[model samples]
Target chain A: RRTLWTTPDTSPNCKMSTEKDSKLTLTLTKCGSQVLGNVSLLAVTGEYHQMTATTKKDVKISLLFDENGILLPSSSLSKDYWNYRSDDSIVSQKYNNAVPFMPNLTAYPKPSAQNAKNYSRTKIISNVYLGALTYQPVIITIAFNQETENGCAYSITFTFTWQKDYSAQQFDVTSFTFSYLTQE
Target chain B: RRTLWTTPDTSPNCKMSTEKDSKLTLTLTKCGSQVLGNVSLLAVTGEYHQMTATTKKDVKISLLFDENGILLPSSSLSKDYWNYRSDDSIVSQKYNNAVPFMPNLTAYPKPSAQNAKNYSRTKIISNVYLGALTYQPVIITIAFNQETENGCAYSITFTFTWQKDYSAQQFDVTSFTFSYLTQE
Candidate 1:
């Protein structure tokens, strides 16, 4: 499955202003449900940008995130649900356990003590694919942070991408977006 | 085990002639004994060249060969002689099976209809490793044909190359040289 993020038309209103001395953190999460079959492969791709300063001052951004696939008991859904199958039915094969391969912690505009004023932008090129099966209730997490002293109010956007295969048919998308702010 | 062939120095009394109207065939037969080991991994890597040509004409060469691996009865060479210790022995091993992988076939100054010429130097380069426990004598058959219709009497020399794997090990000469004649 794929997730994507587009730029928000406008920044969301903030009730509390960030203090220059305090480090700030922001988190975003999404969940999918009732996925069936194998979740052996997952790919994620997207781009992110921070446009917090009015005058476009240099900003730094770092990311930490994880995506997971979970299997639910067959009876959890309604008896006549699309995923329901008879014990003896050939389609009643059990799903394999989910294995997650997480990307390394990444920082945008790469931390350069020598170039402290440059703004940050990071793009996710490729994620993961769960092979032949669609993962149900896929969950993805995105965490954002900035240096305590360099903290000026900052905003971030993200995009997710993925594909689905059904026999000979294939579907893909680069749609999904999220925005968050950090204050010090 | 490796095979080697060498060309003898020219003899003052040696006489050579070319037969352009007929094709020449050369065969190398194993005198006695069978090769031992896994038949699938037989490799042949060597260098050869034509020394003296009866005619100043180009010739086409091709090779044809085969091998056989078998297990004898109790009275024959015992398991020890075959390096078959119960602790490390692989079951049903045989000699002269299909090779594990095909080798790269290349001729220096690649042959082409437009560039084909007579009285040119040629060379072969290759590196191959045979599979485990392979011991089988091989018979090689070769044929040489004149490509040009204007065949002239000529003599050609050939050579083979190989390396010894052990200290004080007597290996067949790494190169072999032979001469053949052609006539039109």
Candidate 2:
């Protein structure tokens, strides 16, 4: 695992506050040759004047595969689906009385043939809120599924970015970064 | 000012664990033109499994317009433009650098005239996060400055969206909705 520290000048000037200073750190954790994990630290201290302390973290993970490769089930479930869950409840709850089953990516209503051509180029981006209190620490974790459908194997990498209020305030954000990699 | 109460569904699967089930209330206070206060009630009762409770009293007061819209000025002169001071020796620091001072729309960097039409029609999307915790009440106040140098008197509507994880354990998100209107 490697830790990367970022100073104030390295980040973009988005909506983050200016009264406080900020520091960010990124860490990468690997699980065997199939799964990769990411951990981040974002710390900020400041007064809640008219402007509240708001933080946004963005994660982008990409997986690359060889040409004409097949994606096979990496687990015993033999499932090639990605299930998104929050807390302990399935996000499908929001679709109550509508669709009872998760949408299938491999069946009808399936993605266009163009998707297959770009299958190896698939990517996922998740946006999450870290926290709100002044000087509080926020931790975000993500795991990549090693199982593949068909017979394809992939090499994956993940990146994380953090942005705070654009103006300075009571506290400065100390750190925001993450890393991940896959091995066969 | 208003008080809002929300709770999880009462179902066989909606089990309120000894450490999870609890009633909470959020209060929003307005002074005149700007929201001046906010307060929250968590675990009103010591019972860890209780799932219902009443909100606290509402404090009725008119809202007031603070300086710099939602941004307060620093107590002492500082080099950071985004730094805002709330009390003596206490400052609220914004995350990014201070927003640049645009004396006029012309002061904004203009792309090549060949791409001016496409660039002029581009709209900016601002994503706001409510920190990392759930069930925490938040109040967002917006102040707009319509009288700018462009001579274009436009009305902008500010919308607020709230989404949260139903389960108290994981932070899986489902749906997001918003409400907004142009200032009168």
Candidate 3:
């Protein structure tokens, strides 16, 4: 996985480019033709900053299958199906203390019928935490898809495209601070 | 957070109890009267096993607000609202290399009207991964609730109760093995 960013503060700033400094990888277990096993995802290693003219607070990015970034997409088989064990999957010693990029590793939900027809086309949101540098909540929509879901897939490739432009104009704040440190 | 388990093989099962050896904690950031900042939940610190007459394998447990456990209960306002950064929230350094308990911390969705009427009464599933110990897949239901959602909660309390018993008897497997390790 690669971190993609957009400079919404500039003119026609919906353009997003893959961050050269960002690096993420998925660790697979038993990902062959047999029953698909665990697919562990590691978080981004490079730093991403959500900067504005007046604000320079560090930004934390989260990857989600849904546009809103909250709901875990439903699996094809079970409604309650999940491949993640929060305690171990999220904070296991295996990742070498790096945060996980996605919560449900091997549990990517089955795309809707409409989504499946269009290459499992769906929206993936890159959640950006700006501390509280409240300005017009600028947002850029991106389109992506689940390339394959034919049972235990050998690999799933996601294609992302910048779709539209939108802005959120509510409250405004000039300066804010947010710094998270992981336990050593 | 405490890991709870039940022994279905026993004569009178379905009785859930907090594991005596399990240890879980919620790491809070600016969780006072103001806007609830980050509420980092670490995964279980103790080992939990799911044993049967023919199968004895390590079991992984996950916490969820829904019975099925796939959906991220919707937040109060925004449809896409999420408090977790999959990569960071799941595998942050602050938790001492612990997996996360829930994907969305500080972002528990608003309980349904019916759920809220009964003290936010809802189901919290402890997803048990037995590595496909598939023998009439036994299941036990538990009820719990979100104590508060009035802005930023000072402290949220949840009470769990064993509710029912169910089983899945489709495919049967006598032996299975699943072992996951973190990268050092």
Candidate 4:
């Protein structure tokens, strides 16, 4: 999905992932529910159809989170989410001391590091869905989960599996889900 | 603090990112964190949790790594990490066309161009927790020092404006970071 634009007013980071001919736009917010804001995938088309195992698996919005923290309406594990992180706790150090495939994480001063406070919080406020273009057709959707929770962004992954039999020409409503991370 | 579901198990692949409800999942792997095991999020909620964040100040997470390779808890300065390379000491035609945002990295390959070596390492075994989410009371907070270390994921960030005193409801972590890229 290629985002044409975003209306941050509605949900700070509302996005539209659609390109030319076969396109669609879906809006989500942090107000869908209390804890797990139910997602809603409103559109679908030719270039954008659900990618799954059964075209006959009830054309309902199937938005859910996967192991990895990627939102899944029309998802692709092929994409890279290894941007840049502050902690290597969840997924320890995998790259060398320096490589060319990650984010540049700058270290800024902690507000109270010099104070009585013990630590600072990292929250996933909202999904600023950075529009990356894609041409596929397996879509499930939904959610308006709130921006912050704990000390980080309450995360979720909307999932869509690559099932072989799903029809390429069909456009249907789908939904997905996901989970967040915290240190033990 | 929550998850919706999870995929079985794959190599060193895992992910994060889901809100309180409807979500998505993206798998990733670096051959780090023990084995190429797997990841999955299986839970849900409503009240919101600390995804790691700054509730008191507008200040945020910043982790940096330099060419010298040191992970700083509160890092700064080094930009030369993307400052190019020199096994031969020149700006060789490196961008896959190496154009754009990809660093002007020199592809210093061994003589064979296909040696016994399997891969190079890029470690960011540091913690520059960037806050993305948070809830009402308890926000998980903390990070490990050592901005740049070896055998770990390499990471750092380029800071921006958006001072502290920002609203928790504002929905803008107002931060981002990316690393370098090469051909070889």
Stretches > 4 Å off in candidate 3 = A1-6, A9-184, B1-19, B31-48, B51-155, B158-184
Residue-level lDDT of model 1, residues A1-184, one tens digit each, is: 2121111212221111121211112212211110111111111111112112231121122222212222222211111111122332212333321212111112222235753322211121112222323461112222222222223122121222222222222212222232211110
Q: Which candidate is the best by lDDT?
A: 2
- Where is model 1 chain B poorest over a 10-residue stretch in terms of lDDT? B34-43
lDDT of 2 by residue, B90-182 (tens): 244443221121111221122345322221101111233333344432322221222223232221112222333222322112222211111
State the lDDT of candidate 1 residue by residue for B44-101, as single tens digits.
1111112222222222222221211122221111221221222212224434332211
In model 3, the Cα lDDT at residue A87 comes to 31
Tens-place lDDT digits, model 3, residues B1-184: 1111111011111111224222122122222122211111111222222222332222222233222212123221111212233322332222221122222322344354743354322333322111222112222222222333333221122222221222221111111111111111
Candidate 4 residue runs with Cα over 4 Å from true position: A1-184, B1-62, B66-68, B72-155, B163-184
Give per-model CA RMSD: 26.3, 22.1, 19.9, 20.1
* TM values, all candidates: 0.14, 0.23, 0.21, 0.23
The DockQ values of the predictions, listed in order, are: 0.01, 0.02, 0.03, 0.04
lDDT of each model, Cα atoms only?
0.20, 0.24, 0.22, 0.24
lDDT per residue, candidate 4, B30-131, as tens digits?
111111111112112221123224433322233333233333333322111212222212233322121222112232222233545522322221112223
lDDT of 4 by residue, A1-184 (tens): 1111112112212112332212222322211101112233322332334433433432222122222323333431111222223332113333222111111111111133352221121112222111211333343321112212333222322433233353444443332222121211
The superposed Cα distance between candidate 4 and the true structure at residue B54, in angstroms, equals: 15
Q: Kindly report, for each predicted structure in the order presented, the TM-score of its chain A compared with the true chain A.
A: 0.18, 0.25, 0.22, 0.25
